[PDB]
Symmetry: C5
Subunit: 359 residues, 5 copies
C-alpha cells in the first residue's frame, strides 16, 4: 500500500471527515487528559508580579473516526503539517500575558495516532503568567503561583478537561532558580468557571516557592548591625567635652536613613508594613536614641558649669559630675543588652510564624 493514498483517504476529500465538527456530536462530552512538562522556569520578578515559564503541553483525546485498522503496526508518527485538517480542542490560559509559539526551522509540533483513535498533541509554548504574590513577610516568605487551563468556547456538556492520574506534572532534571527553591509538592485541583454565557471547565496547577535568605542577609542585615556598633563607639570612650560625638551621631543617622530608603527600591509599593521595614525602623530608633543620650549628658554638664560660675558652687559640682558619669556608664552597659533581647525575640517569632505558615 502506498503511504500517500492512505494518508489522504484517512483525512481528505474522499473521507467525510469535516474538521469543524467535534467527535461524538450530539453525544457525551469529549474527555481530555492533559499532561504538562516544565522545560524552564525563570524571571520571577516582583514589580511586574509575573514569571516566565516554558512548558511542553500534551493533551490526549479519543475520536471514533480516524480508526484505520489497515497497517499492521499500532501507531503512526505523522507529519506536523496536517495539524490544521483535524479537530484540535481549544485551550487558553486565564492568567496569561503574551504566550507566543516557537517556529525555528520548523514549527515545534507533534502528532501521533493509534489504531483505536487515541491521538497525541504536543505543543511548545513560553507563557508569561501573573502571580499575585503577598509580601507580608518580605525577607522570609512562601509564594504560591497559579497556572490555569480553561476552555474558551465550549460549555460543561462538552470537552471536559481532566488531569492525568500518573505523572501529571514533570520537571526537567537539574533545573534551578537563582532566588527561589522549588518545592516538590505540586498539588493539583480543579475549579470550574461560571459566567452569564455559560459554565466552562477549568483545571489548576499550584507551585510553592521558598525564598533564599542568602542575599538579603549580607546586603541589609550585616551592614545595619555594624552601623549600630559604630554608633555605640561614642559612648564608651569620647569624653563629655567632645565636638566630634555630635558629628558622628549626625552622620550615622544620615547613613541609616539613606540606607533604609535604598533597601525598599526593587519592591513594589504596598500599603502594609513589611518585616524589613520593622527591622530598619527599630535600628533607626536605636541610633537616633544615642544622639539623644549625648544631648542629655551635655545639658547636665551645662547646668554643672553654670552653677560652678556662680564652696557653695563646689557643693553641687560633685553630685552633677557623678550624675553625668552615672548616665554614661549606664548607657554603656544597657544599650547592647536591649538590642540583644530585641534581636532574639524578632528572629524567634519569624522562625515560628514561617513554620506555621508552610504547613
Amino acid at each position: 500500500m502506498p503511504p500517500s493514498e492512505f494518508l489522504d483517504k484517512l483525512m481528505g476529500k474522499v473521507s467525510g471527515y469535516d474538521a469543524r465538527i467535534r467527535p461524538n456530536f450530539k453525544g457525551p462530552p469529549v474527555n481530555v487528559t492533559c499532561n504538562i512538562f516544565i522545560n524552564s522556569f525563570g524571571s520571577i520578578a516582583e514589580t511586574t508580579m509575573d514569571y516566565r515559564v516554558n512548558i511542553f503541553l500534551r493533551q490526549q483525546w479519543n475520536d471514533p473516526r480516524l480508526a484505520y485498522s489497515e497497517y499492521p503496526d499500532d501507531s503512526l508518527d505523522l507529519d506536523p503539517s496536517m495539524l490544521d485538517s483535524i479537530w484540535k480542542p481549544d485551550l487558553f490560559f486565564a492568567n496569561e500575558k503574551g504566550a507566543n509559539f516557537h517556529e525555528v526551522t520548523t514549527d515545534n509540533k507533534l502528532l501521533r495516532i493509534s489504531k483505536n483513535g487515541n491521538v497525541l498533541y504536543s505543543i511548545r509554548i513560553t507563557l508569561v503568567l501573573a502571580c499575585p504574590m503577598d509580601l507580608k513577610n518580605f525577607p522570609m516568605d512562601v509564594q504560591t503561583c497559579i497556572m490555569q487551563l480553561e476552555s474558551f468556547g465550549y460549555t460543561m456538556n462538552d470537552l471536559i478537561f481532566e488531569w492525568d492520574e500518573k505523572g501529571a506534572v514533570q520537571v526537567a532534571d537539574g533545573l534551578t532558580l537563582p532566588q527561589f527553591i522549588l518545592k516538590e509538592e505540586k498539588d493539583l485541583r480543579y475549579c470550574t468557571k461560571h459566567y452569564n454565557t455559560g459554565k466552562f471547565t477549568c483545571i489548576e496547577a499550584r507551585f510553592h516557592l521558598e525564598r533564599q535568605m542568602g542575599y538579603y542577609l549580607i546586603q541589609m542585615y550585616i551592614p545595619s548591625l555594624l552601623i549600630v556598633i559604630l554608633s555605640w563607639v561614642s559612648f564608651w570612650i569620647n569624653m563629655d567635652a567632645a565636638p566630634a560625638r555630635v558629628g558622628l551621631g549626625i552622620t550615622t543617622v544620615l547613613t541609616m536613613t539613606t540606607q533604609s530608603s535604598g533597601s525598599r527600591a526593587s519592591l513594589p509599593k504596598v500599603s502594609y508594613v513589611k518585616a524589613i521595614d520593622i527591622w530598619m525602623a527599630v535600628c533607626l530608633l536605636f541610633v537616633f536614641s544615642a544622639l539623644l543620650e549625648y544631648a542629655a549628658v551635655n545639658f547636665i554638664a551645662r547646668q554643672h558649669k553654670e552653677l560652678l560660675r556662680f564652696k557653695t558652687v563646689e557643693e553641687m559640682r560633685k553630685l552633677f559630675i557623678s550624675r553625668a558619669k552615672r548616665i554614661d556608664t549606664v548607657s554603656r552597659v544597657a544599650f547592647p543588652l536591649v538590642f540583644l533581647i530585641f534581636n532574639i525575640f524578632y528572629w524567634i517569632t519569624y522562625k515560628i510564624i514561617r513554620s506555621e505558615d508552610i504547613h
Copy 2:
C-alpha cells in the same frame, strides 16, 4: 440530517448570503447591545499616562437571514473558524494604543446563533488605554479613566451602539490592585461623535480609582517629621559656644533638599504645584529657619563679647546674656507649637477637599 450539509447551506455557495452587505440593507439601523467583562486590571502608571486592561468584549445583534428553523433545538454552538464568512460589525477604541489579539493553541473566539437570528460574538483583547490623570492633589486623589467604543466606518443611520440594560459591566471576583481601590459605581453614559465626514456613534464607560495612602506616608511623611525633630535637637541643649550646631544645621538642610528632590522622581513633570511639594517646602522652611535662629543668637553673643573687651562693660553683659537666653528659651517653646498648628490645618483642609471632590 448531516451537520456539514446544513452548515454549508446556511452560509455557503447555495446561500445568497453575501458577507459584504449589512443586514436590513436600505433599512432601519442595526441595533447592537455591548456587554463587557473585565478579566484583569493592571499597570496603572503615571509617566505614560495609561493603564493595561484585559476585557471580554461581547456584542449581540439581529439578522433576518441565518434563521434556520430546521433543527429541533434553540441555539447552536458553532466553530470559531467561520467567523470570516459573516457580517461582523466594526468597532474600535478611541483612546487606544496597541490592543493585540490572543492566539494560544486556537484563536480565542466564540460564536452562537439562535433560531430567530440573534448572534453572540465574544472576543478577548488586551487594551492599553490612555487616561489623562490630573495630579492636583498628589498623595490623596481620585482618578477617572475613560473607555470609549465607537464605529469607524458607519454613520448614525446605521449600526447604532446601545448599552446593556442589566449587568452591563462585570468584574472578576477577587480582583485587586496594589496601588488603587476600585470603586463599584461604574456610571455609563454615551456621547456621539461629530466629524466633517459624518456623525458617528460612540459609548463610554467610566471607572473611579482611589489611591492608597499607605506607601506614601511611610516613604515621605514619616522621615521628614523625624528630620524636623532632629533639627530641633540643637536648640534645647547645645550651649551658645558650639561649632557643631552649625554643622548639624547644614547637614539637616542638605538631607532635606536631597530628599525633596528625590520624592518628585516617578511623577511626570507638570506646571502646577502638588500637595507634596507644599508640605516639603514648609518643612524645608522650618529647618532653614532654625539655622537662622543660631545665626541670630551668635551675633548677639558677638556684640556682648565685643563690648566686654572694651564696670561699664559689665553694665551691658547681663542684659545681652539675658537677651540671648530669652531668644533660646522662646525658640524652644515656640517651634513645636507652630508646626502642630500647621499640621492640623493642612490635614483638615485636605480631608475636607477630598470629601467634597468625591461627591
Copy 3:
C-alpha cells in the same frame, strides 16, 4: 436591483477595471487633496528627538471609471474589505520611524464613492516622527516639528499632492500636552523633492510648541537661590575665629556641583552651552567666591596675630583688625546687590530674545 450584482459589475471580472493602472493613463497628472485630523499628540521626548502622533489621514481623488449613475442616491458607503481591488495612491512619510496600522476587531478603514467618481479614503495610523529640536535656550524655547508626506514611486508628471483649501488640519477638542502648549497657527507650505532618479512631490505641515516654565522653575531655580542665601549666612554673623565657616563653605560648594551635574541628566549631549548652564555656572561662581572671602580675612587675621606675637605690636593691631572688619561689612552689603543686578539682566535679556524669536 440586487446589491451584489452591481457591486461585482462595478469592480469585478466583467468590468475591465485593472487595479494596476492609474486613472487617466497617458494623461494629465492625478490631483489628490489631503486632509489630516490629529486624534492625539504625546511623548515629546528629547534624547530620542522624536514624538508620537495618532492621525486620521484622508485623501480624495477623481476617477473617470467607477461612475455608476444607476442607483438613485448620490453616494455609497462601501465595505472596507475591497480596498485592495482599486487604485490606492502611494504615500509615505519621510521623517518616519515605525508607523504601524490598527486592526482591532476590524481593520480601521473607510470607503466612499460618489456618482461622478470622487472617492474618499480614510486611514488611522500612529506615527513616530523625528523632530530635530534645537536647545539653544533650554528652559524657554519654541520648537518646530515637521510632518512630510511624499510620493515614493511616481514623478511630478503624475499624482500631484495638493493641500485642502478649507480646514486642512483639525485638532481634537480638549487635547492637551503635559509639557508643551500647542500654538494654533499651523502654517502649511510644500517643498518638492529632487533626486537623481527623478522629481517627486511632497507637502509639509508645521507645528509650533511653547514649553511651560512651571516645572523647571521649582525644580532648579528655587533651590539654587536658597543655597546662595545659605552660603551668605556665614558672612553676616560667624566671628573670624570660626572652624565651622569653612565646613559650611565646602558643603555648599559640594551640593552646588552635585546639583549642577544632576540638572543636565535628561537632556541629550550637545556641544553648545545652554542657558541653564550659564545660570548654574554663575551661581557656582558666587558660592565659591564666598569661601575665598573667608580665606582672605583669615590670612589678614593671621598677619595681625603674627605681628602681635613679635607698643610697636599694638601699633598695627588696630589697623589690621579694622581692615578685617572692613572686608567683612563690605562683603555683607555688596554680595546681594550684585546678585540682584545679574538676575534682572538675565531675566530681561531672555524675555526679550524670546519675544523676538517667536515672531
Copy 4:
C-alpha cells in the same frame, strides 16, 4: 533541455514526490550531519543569564529520490523559493528564547543538490540562548555555555543527528568580545533525551569563556586600597588631642560601605558569597578597626587626665602617656604588615584555584 521542464519534473505534479513522507520510509533512520558557523557573538549578560549569537546552520542528508542523472554537471544551485516543496528535517534548540529568522530583500536561504541525492541546507538564525553561569568566584572565573540541537517530533529510530568529523565548528576571523576571551577548545559531545512520549536525539556544543581582569581591577581594587591608605593617615601623625581624627574615620567608613553597596549592582542576587564580597568585607573590617584604635587611645588619655586632676598624680602620668604612645607606634607599624600578608594570601589562593579549575 529546458530548465523549467526538468525543474518541475523533479519535484512537481508528474513526480510522485510527496513532501510529507520521510525518505527511506519504513527503513533505517535518516542520518544527518550538522555543521555550524558562528558569525557573531555578543551581549553576554548576567542578570538575564543569557547571550546572543548569530549562526549559519548547515545540515546535510541523503535522499534516494531527487537523483536526476540527466544534466552533465555534478551539482545544481537551486532557488531558495522551493524550499517548501521538499522534506526539511525538524530541528529546534532546547535552551532557546526567541530565535527569529532574517528576511532582508530576500529570505536568507541556500539550496544545493548533487547527482546522488545529497542535499545542502543553510539557514541564518540569531539565537538568544540561556547560560546558567555560576558566580562562585566573581572577578576571576571560567563560564561554560551550552548549545543544544534536538529533534522535536521524531524518535531514535528516525532522523539520527550526527556531528561533522572535520571542521564541525568554525568561527569568523577577527571576532572579539569586549569582556571575555574565547577559548579555542570547543569540545563536542552528544546526550540523548528521554521522555515519557519517547526517546529523542540531541547533540551538544560547549564554549569556554575567560573573563578579563582589566576593568574590575581599576574600578574596584584600586580605589579601596587608596581609601585604606587614607584611613592609615590619621595614626602616623595627628596628635591625641584631635577632633578631626574621628570625622576622618567616620567619613572613610561611610564611603567604604557606600562603595561596597555600589559594587554589587549589576550582578544578579545569589545566596552564596562571592570573592569580591570577601575582599570588601576585609577592607571594611580594617577601616572600622582603625576608628576603634582611636577610641582606645582616647579612653586611656581620659584616664590619665582624670587621675591627673585628682606627686601622686604625677606617678601615673608618665606610665599612662607612655602606654598611649606605645599603642600609637605599634598600630603604626603593625597595620600595613597584616594587610600585606592578607593580600598575598588572597591572591595566591585565587591564582591556584583558577589553575586547578581551568583543567
Copy 5:
C-alpha cells in the same frame, strides 16, 4: 494597444518567463551595480556597539528577456505589486541586526524597465549595524563604521556585485548628528568572502566619524580643575593650628573619587586604560598629595611642641618653625607650576597623536 494585455504578455502565462531562473543561465555572471542613498543617520551608541541608519538601496542589472520594443517610449514606470513575478537578486548585510521593511499605506518599492532590459529596483530599509569601535582615546577619537553587502546564495561565477562609478554614495542635505561630525570621504573598497561551501561576492562602504569635544569638556574637565583649585585653598591661608584643613581635604578627596566613578558610567567595560582615566587619576593624585602635605607639616609642628615642653627648648623652636613655614611657602609656589606643565604636556601629546591618526 491595451496596457493590461501587454503587461501580462510580458511576464505572464503566455510568456515562458520563469521567475526561478537567473538571466543568462549557463552563461557569464550577472553584473549588478549598487547605489546607496542615506536618508538618516542616528543613535550612535557605545554599550550596544551599533548604530541606526535608514537607506534607499538601488540596484540595477540587465536581462535579455523583458525587452519589449513595442511601445514608442523608452522606459515604463510599473506598479510595485508585481515585484514577486521577476528575478530579484539576493542581498543581505553581514553585520546586521534586525533590518525590517516599511509598509505605510503601501509597501515602499519602485520598479522601472527600459527598452533594452535594464531594470531599476529601489527599496527603503532601516538597518541596525554593528560597529566595533575602539576606545583607546575616549574624549578625542575617530571611529570607522563598516557597511557590508554580500550574496548569500550564489558563488563568484554568478551575480558579481560592483559599485557605481559616479555618485556611489549620497547623503541627504542638511543631515546632522548631535555627537559626531560626519567626514565627507567615504572610501569604497570590496573584499570577497571565502567559505568551505564556496566563494561569495561582497562590497564594503566605510564612514569616518569625529567626536565633538563640547560636551565632555564642560561635563568633566571644567569641574575637576575647579576642585583642584579648591584643594589648593587650604595651603595659602589656613594656619598650622587648623582642624578644618583636614576636613576640607577629606571632602575634596571623597568628591574626587565619586566624580571619577560617575564619569565612567555610559562607557562599556574595557580592559585597556582610556585617556579620561589618566587625567582623573592624575587629578586624584594631586588632591591626595595635598592632604599629605598637611600631614607632614602637622607632624613637624608636633615635634616642635614636644621639644618645647621638655633656653635649650628655645634653641630648636626657631629652626622647627622656620622649617614648617618653609614647607608651606614651597608647597604654595610649587603645586600650580607642576599642574601647568602636566596639562600642557597632556594636551600637546593628544593633539599630535590625533593629527597622526586621522591621516
